[PDB]
Coordinates of all heavy atoms in Angstrom, one line a residue:
Chain C
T998 N 104.8 149.3 187.2 CA 103.8 150.2 186.5 C 103.5 149.9 185.1 O 102.3 150.2 184.7 CB 104.2 151.7 186.7 OG1 105.3 151.9 185.8 CG2 104.6 152.1 188.0
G999 N 104.4 149.2 184.4 CA 104.1 149.0 182.9 C 104.4 150.4 182.2 O 104.2 150.4 181.0
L1000 N 104.8 151.4 182.9 CA 105.1 152.6 182.3 C 106.7 152.9 182.5 O 107.3 152.3 183.2 CB 104.4 153.8 183.1 CG 102.9 153.7 183.3 CD1 102.5 154.9 184.3 CD2 102.2 153.7 182.1
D1038 N 103.3 154.2 178.3 CA 103.1 152.7 178.6 C 103.9 151.9 177.7 O 103.7 151.8 176.4 CB 101.6 152.5 178.4 CG 101.2 151.1 178.1 OD1 102.1 150.1 178.4 OD2 100.0 150.8 177.8
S1041 N 102.3 148.0 176.2 CA 101.3 148.0 175.0 C 102.1 148.5 173.7 O 101.5 148.2 172.7 CB 100.2 149.2 175.2 OG 99.6 148.8 176.4
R1043 N 105.1 147.2 173.1 CA 105.9 146.0 172.7 C 107.4 146.3 172.8 O 108.2 146.1 171.9 CB 105.5 145.4 171.3 CG 104.1 145.4 170.9 CD 103.0 145.3 172.0 NE 103.1 144.1 172.9 CZ 102.2 143.9 173.7 NH1 101.1 144.5 174.0 NH2 102.4 142.7 174.5
Chain D
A198 N 97.2 139.7 175.8 CA 97.6 140.8 174.9 C 96.6 142.0 175.1 O 97.0 143.2 174.7 CB 97.6 140.4 173.5
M200 N 95.5 143.2 177.9 CA 95.8 143.9 179.3 C 96.8 144.9 179.0 O 97.9 144.8 178.3 CB 96.4 142.9 180.3 CG 95.6 141.6 180.6 SD 96.0 140.9 182.1 CE 97.7 140.5 181.7
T201 N 96.4 146.1 179.6 CA 97.4 147.3 179.5 C 97.4 148.0 180.8 O 96.4 147.8 181.7 CB 97.0 148.4 178.4 OG1 95.8 149.1 179.0 CG2 96.5 147.7 177.1
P202 N 98.4 148.7 181.1 CA 98.4 149.5 182.3 C 97.3 150.5 182.6 O 97.0 150.9 183.6 CB 99.8 150.4 182.2 CG 100.7 149.4 181.4 CD 99.8 148.8 180.4
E203 N 96.5 150.7 181.5 CA 95.4 151.6 181.5 C 94.2 150.9 181.8 O 93.1 151.6 182.2 CB 95.3 152.3 180.1 CG 96.4 153.4 179.9 CD 97.8 152.7 179.6 OE1 97.8 151.8 178.7 OE2 98.7 153.0 180.3
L205 N 94.0 147.9 184.0 CA 94.2 146.8 185.1 C 93.2 147.2 186.2 O 92.8 148.4 186.5 CB 95.6 147.0 185.6 CG 96.7 146.6 184.6 CD1 98.1 146.6 185.2 CD2 96.5 145.4 183.8

Side-chain angles (χ1 to χ4, degrees):
Chain C
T998 65
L1000 313 174
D1038 160 15
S1041 305
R1043 324 330 302 191
Chain D
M200 305 195 304
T201 76
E203 293 68 57
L205 304 186

